[PDB]
Design a protein around this ligand. Structure first.
Ligand code: HEM
Length: 431
């Protein structure tokens, strides 16, 4: 019956400029208007919800109620043929296709190359008397990603990271189409990446077909009419995998490096765990599955510092939640970082405690959708198990060979956009 409280502000524009400029935008309007507040963003009316009951609603009867929604600049720079921007039955089809790159045994098989790249970066970081971490994790993740998705020779194309960086920086920028803008820069970085992605694909097309990585899996894939994915699609899809893992996983690793830096007890607890095993050079996918305490740590890392703040959906049906009215063609924004800061769901919600996830912990006795670092439902992270594998293999190889000290004085407060990151971007020494 009734619509949520809150200011629509100006016609079309709404509170768009406040959204774009104001850090505690959602906090100010949650406090005035309570837990469910309306607003207006870029010509759409928008409801902000949060916490377990709102998540269940979003991830419930999902198909007929909610569809993905992106800003104009993002639609354009991602393109019309990416998982993120595809809809209904095409999204249903492409999600099954791409999950082939992420099966538990395709994941296992990624461990060598992945291990070599983490081992590689680990030497280089040791010999430095200081390491500025955030930008260095960025390069390492991109290297794992581009190696596992397209082959080692593709990742030693040195034009790729700089272009990709410039591509990302303008994904959520204003769509102002002059060459000297974040968006015009992204546009040109996109064209450069696409022309490179083509060469890589056409060259792989010319070889004995294999389904050992993501690019081969994509080539062998068939749509619902039994047709190969077209060439623009292959390209968008690979860019999407790159975009979707980049900031997120970099943020996750930074946060772990941060939190076990400032918590040497938990790091020794994680070290103890790996000593009770047979700590040889070799590291199996199976030995990694014998690490329940590190699993807790990574659970906790992701709840305290969630890499994806939240998300948006658009109502395709008039519907209702908590008695409030949620009208067709308005938008809904859910709030991962809010859910993860809620005091009921997490007591002392600002302390780092891996015990919350022990068999009878605080977070074990919580209702569905209380821990949502990967979202949920139809759009839940397609790369969460890949993400979990790299977080874990890294955490292991780090702790195995290194203690580490942050440096005093540095501002390690977090910038929330686009992904949480210490302001001095985490400077460090390895022991
Ligand atoms: C490291 C921690 C990561 C976190 C916390 C994370 C979080 C998320 C979340 C919350 C969503 C849902 C977006 C929404 O609600 O609208 C999402 C989507 C997605 N993620 Fe991740 N992500 C991570 C890493 C990765 C990686 C490494 C990959 C790929 C290798 C990946 C691939 C994807 C894809 C393809 C989607 C879109 C799925 C779809 O539209 O069907 N993520 N991620």
């Amino acid at each position: 019956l009734p619509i949520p409280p809150g200011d629509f502000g100006l016609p079309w524009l709404g509170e768009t400029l406040n959204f774009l400029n104001d850090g505690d935008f959602g906090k100010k309007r949650q406090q005035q208007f309570g837990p469910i507040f309306k607003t207006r963003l870029f010509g759409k009316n928008v409801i902000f919800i949060s916490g377990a009951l709102a998540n269940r609603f979003l991830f419930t009867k999902e198909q007929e109620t909610f569809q993905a929604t992106w800003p104009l600049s993002t639609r354009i720079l991602l393109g019309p043929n990416a998982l993120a921007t595809q809809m209904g039955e095409i999204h249903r089809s492409r999600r099954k296709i791409l999950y082939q790159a992420f099966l538990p045994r395709t994941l296992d098989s990624y461990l060598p190359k992945m291990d070599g790249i983490v081992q590689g970066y680990l030497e280089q970081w040791g010999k430095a008397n200081e390491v500025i971490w955030y930008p260095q994790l960025r390069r390492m993740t991109f290297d794992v990603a581009a190696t596992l998705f397209m082959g080692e020779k593709v990742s030693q194309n040195p034009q790729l990271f700089p272009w990709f960086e410039t591509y990302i920086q303008g994904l959520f920028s204003l769509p102002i189409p002059l060459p000297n803008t974040l968006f015009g820069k992204s546009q040109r970085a996109r064209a450069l990446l696409l022309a490179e992605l083509e060469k890589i694909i056409k060259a792989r097309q010319q070889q004995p077909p294999s389904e050992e990585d993501a690019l081969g899996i994509l080539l062998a894939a068939r749509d619902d009419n039994n047709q190969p994915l077209s060439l623009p699609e292959l390209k968008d899809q690979i860019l999407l995998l790159l975009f979707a893992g980049h900031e997120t996983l970099t943020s996750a690793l930074s946060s772990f490096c941060l939190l076990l830096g400032q918590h040497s007890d938990i790091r020794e607890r994680v070290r103890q765990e790996q000593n009770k095993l047979q700590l040889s050079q070799e590291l199996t996918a199976e030995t990694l599955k014998k690490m329940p305490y590190l699993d807790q740590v990574l659970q906790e890392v992701l709840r305290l510092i969630p890499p994806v703040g939240g998300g948006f959906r658009e109502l395709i049906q008039d519907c209702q939640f908590q008695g409030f009215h949620f009208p067709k063609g308005w938008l809904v924004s859910y709030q991962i970082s809010q859910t993860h800061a809620d005091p009921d769901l997490y007591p002392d919600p600002e302390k780092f405690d891996p015990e919350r996830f022990t068999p009878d912990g605080s977070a074990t006795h919580n209702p569905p959708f209380a821990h949502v670092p990967f979202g949920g439902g139809l759009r839940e992270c397609l790369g969460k198990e890949f993400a979990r594998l790299e977080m874990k293999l890294f955490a292991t190889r780090l702790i195995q060979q290194f203690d580490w000290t942050l440096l005093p004085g540095q501002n390690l407060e977090l910038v929330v956009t686009p992904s949480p990151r210490p302001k001095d971007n985490l400077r460090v020494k390895l022991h």
